[PDB]
Amino acid sequence: PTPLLDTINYPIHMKNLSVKELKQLSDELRSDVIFNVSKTGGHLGSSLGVVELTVALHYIFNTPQDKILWDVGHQSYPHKILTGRRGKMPTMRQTNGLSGFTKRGESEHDCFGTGHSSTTISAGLGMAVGRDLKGKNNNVVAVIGDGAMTAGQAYEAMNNAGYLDSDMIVILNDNKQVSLPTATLDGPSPPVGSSLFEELGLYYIGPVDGHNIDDLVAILKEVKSTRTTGPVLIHVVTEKGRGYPYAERADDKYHGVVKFDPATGRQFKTTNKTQSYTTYFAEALVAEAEVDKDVVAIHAAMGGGTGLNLFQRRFPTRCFDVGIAEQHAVTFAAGLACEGLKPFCAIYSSFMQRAYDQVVHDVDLQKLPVRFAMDRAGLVGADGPTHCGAFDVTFMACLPNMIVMAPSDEADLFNMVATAVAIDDRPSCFRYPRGNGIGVALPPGNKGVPIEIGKGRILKEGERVALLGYGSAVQSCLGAAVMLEERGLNVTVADARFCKPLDRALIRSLAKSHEVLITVEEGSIGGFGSHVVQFLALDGLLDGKLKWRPMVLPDRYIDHGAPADQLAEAGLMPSHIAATALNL
Amino acid sequence: PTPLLDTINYPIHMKNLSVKELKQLSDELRSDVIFNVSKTGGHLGSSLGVVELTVALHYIFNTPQDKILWDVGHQSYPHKILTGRRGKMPTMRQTNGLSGFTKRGESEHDCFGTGHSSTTISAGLGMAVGRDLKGKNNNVVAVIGDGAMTAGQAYEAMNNAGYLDSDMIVILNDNKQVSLPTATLDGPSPPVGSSLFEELGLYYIGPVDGHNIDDLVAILKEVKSTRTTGPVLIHVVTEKGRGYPYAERADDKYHGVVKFDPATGRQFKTTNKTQSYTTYFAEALVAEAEVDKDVVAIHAAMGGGTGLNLFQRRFPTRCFDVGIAEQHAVTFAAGLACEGLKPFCAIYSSFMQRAYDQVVHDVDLQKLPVRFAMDRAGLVGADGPTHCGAFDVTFMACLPNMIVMAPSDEADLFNMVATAVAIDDRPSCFRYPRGNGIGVALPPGNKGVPIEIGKGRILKEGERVALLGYGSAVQSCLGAAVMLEERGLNVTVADARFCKPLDRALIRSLAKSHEVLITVEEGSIGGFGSHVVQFLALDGLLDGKLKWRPMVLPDRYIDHGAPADQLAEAGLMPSHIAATALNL
Amino acid sequence: HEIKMRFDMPGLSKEDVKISVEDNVLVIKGEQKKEDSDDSWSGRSVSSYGTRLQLPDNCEKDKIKAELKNGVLFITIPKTKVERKVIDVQIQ
């Protein structure tokens, strides 16, 4: 039922269209986005409410005349549609296909590749003053939602913009305060329920209704050609999930909606055999929150993506909502960790770097007791490297006073939470991937057994060759033997779950026993492989002369797509790990 | 002339004092602080204006009854005085002595060790809700200046506080908008010149005059016992430098005042033989800013501490003031770097982690052309590890698309700026220490010769043993030979200024030529030593079997004090480097 | 301290904007709906919000400056100090 849209492949097509037909076009957009997302993994409800805006700021402002800036990129579906990427939606989020977010290095109109909240308005101000410095006379628009209004970059950049009076545009979203979040938020805590940022120096129009394209077109053409002087901010009323009567009351319930029935919203319940680690975490943390008084979890609006809703309404006063500000959290952790409490942070492995300051200074210099749950370890799969948190083992494990631990399955997951909630002399951190394993039940079913701080875990027997690693990697190390175990078990696998303090005893035993060793990790090369050889070096005076090759994330950003091929791309399908020893 | 102060060693002494004598006491405090700072290195003008407040919030609120929170800690001088640390001022900033900032791990009243701007109000809110969760009924006060009002943590934490209605106190400073900065700001750009924080939800009293202790005592006792409900923010009018008629018009000119004449303000001009690197940088950048159109430098209010005042008024439209928000800058860099410009960032090696998000995502995923000037590399000397930026080689050099360079002297400093301003296909970063060298003049005097990207630099001849390193370290490597060069020059020194892309050719040549190798760096162990062996490992198939021991910052936080002993403490005086090879 | 607020809002909608400046309470209903007449433009931009400015000092009446009701709302009204200073709310 989409007449007008089969005609447009860039805004020049629609430049002369009228508002009456503009509305029908926006409706066709709703329908097309729904039919496209019903293939896979589309952050639906935002873009559903955003179709209107996409239309407006592709009609009024020309691109790449006007450098438009969107938010994180989840609601970039209509934009991509109207920017020569309608015919590629059956390949978005797939391998070799489109990223789920705006990606500068794709098309001439892909203005600035987003992928992290609030990280845009600053670059938009930058382009604004830069074009005013090259003498050019363009318009630069930054679109964000309230979800990006909470973080720091937004506040600081927008204040500085209102200061510089650089001619630029800002666009806020979601008047009803339902957020515009990170990629993998499965669900935030549902609420039951303006800016006057002129003190910050901007101009603040809206929130106007982002549900009548007539309104917006009568704005950006009417006032905001380059005649506009200085920066302007555009809040917009947007019913997230607008256009799909299921998500219209079930937005978060269809926000990160998997391939769903376009007629009933039906989704796949096939994952009910083994649960995700994020569920395997909030399921389990309550088994320490019930038996303890001051166990508190800290999250930056990654509840669903961390499962911690199993924790919040159970203990309505030991789970805290800080918005998406990883910095304010990690100290609000330490700020509680000085009260003798044991507040413990659940924050995505990539999203930690948002706060890497406080982890370095406000905690490890204070030695305060904060345990970190670095969710979404390394390869996130179908959301692009703008979530590939393959640095956690690098930026954390370099710090003194911090303990780095990563599971192997649901058992080790909570076999360690029984430790990192036990210890409160110092901080620690959890590096658990996103996926599945083989999980014995709660410490009821014997999984909450704390283990010695700094103690490794041999998981297999093998003497001609060694093997190490942690995070999702040891499962792949288990999987690494599949083409290896049938060779007399040359391989032993040692999930040395402690990255620092390392099981310096284990590695040492591993060292002299074998003639070769191969670590592996889901992080860039500043982490386990680095620390292990750093320890291998000094301990080396007992012949640190065994071949050692850290198969880490190669120096490149692995794109979106199928996690299995991401392993194949990143050289981390077991065969890659397998081949490494095979050369020896 | 200090009658009352020889009597007080904790606020319990002054609990019954009267306001008339309170003022005289504050005056005695001004005088004592001046006589103490005239020994060394005191961040004077703030604390000079802060004496009043220190008095008030040590009189009203009891400690450790009430967890008071100061700003970065520069104006902690009066606080320390009134907290059993008046008699230690002749040892503050020295080795084994006091830190120039509040340090939680020192005294029972040292509430939360600050050292980075805006990193406090969050921890203050944390303590507030925590004490309300332990049932305790205390008061938690956070004191900050406008200098901490700009950054992100402040905005986000204070919004979240106004949300949680947790009973807490916030204190803003410096009504006249003269800032409260980072430690080593030698001078900001001097300016010629109501704060609605109700949208942030808190309560905002002030700015009242922080120059009559009568005013403040009639406030915190009058309304802000625990009867106060929710969070409150206290702006205060404070003439920075109050009490010293020189700094009263020369605050920044006596802010980071070296041991000065308490009668005339005279300071030591003895440093006019060799200039600092920060001067050696802005002196030199203009030699590329004159011959180029879009060379722009970016700084977060570290002008004096980066010398970039040699750059600002020269090019009043190619140097930008962003406040102290390292995040908003590093993209405002990239946001300009997409306009084909070449905007280049000068930000302290420690203060980068404040923004490590954007360097990871908003730049290296965009491959935008931003060059970083990581000032204050590693050992900052007399300001404590709350500035020890010994992670820059770790968190940066792990990224793809980023080039890491560090000088050896003023020559290599600008021999590379001629490169990192030349290249704009990608980002890069400068790791220069704080100190001195041996500097030939500007590219006029032949120092602006660009060098091949990824090319090392052998600085000495030596074949039985190798040696590497960069930053301040290669000078120490030069200095390392002083007890080594007289041994037949076993040592060669190779300032392989490129950390990534490494001079993979040099290291390889170095490898087979020698039988031993020793890198060294001013960073924690996630950097050069890691990357070099990571490259040593894969290249190792040509016998990566040479002994290699990265003498990096040991896993500990090196305190304030004399830089030479910091080298001795951190195991980085040449003898330590010397001893390493001596074992072989 | 003293109370101040300006509304840049070029083309401040003529739907509902209000000003009331008492002691430490203040209601500053700054609003840009654009629900029918954007500024004079065609738009069904259904919107809902108003502005609140309480004050952490009972706003006395020494100096008042106001420029408002068409495109801006801007008010400045004073006080300084003590007796239960709260803004945006007086929580129990």
Residue numbers in the entry:
A (entry chain 13), B (entry chain 11): 73 to 265, 318 to 708
C (entry chain 12): 136 to 227
Task: Give verbatim lines from the article.
Small heat shock proteins (sHsps) represent a class of highly conserved molecular chaperones that prevent irreversible unfolding or aggregation of proteins under stress conditions to maintain protein homeostasis.
Here we succeed in obtaining the Hsp21-DXPS complex by co-expression of both Hsp21 and DXPS in E. coli at 37 °C under conditions that promote thermally induced aggregation of DXPS and soluble complex formation, and determining its structure by cryo-EM. The first interface lies between the β5-β7 loop connecting β5 and β7 strands of the ACD of Hsp21 and residues 335–348 within domain I of one DXPS monomer containing an α-helix. Consistent with this notion, the segment 247–274 directly connecting to the mobile loops also undergo structural arrangement as a result of Hsp21 binding, thereby converting one active site from a closed to an open conformation. The map permitted the construction of a model of the ACD with seven β strands (denoted as β2- β9, with β6 missing in our structure), in striking contrast to the six-stranded ACD structure identified in the Hsp21-DXPS complex, suggesting that the ACD partly unfolds to peel away the first β strand (β2) during its interaction with DXPS.
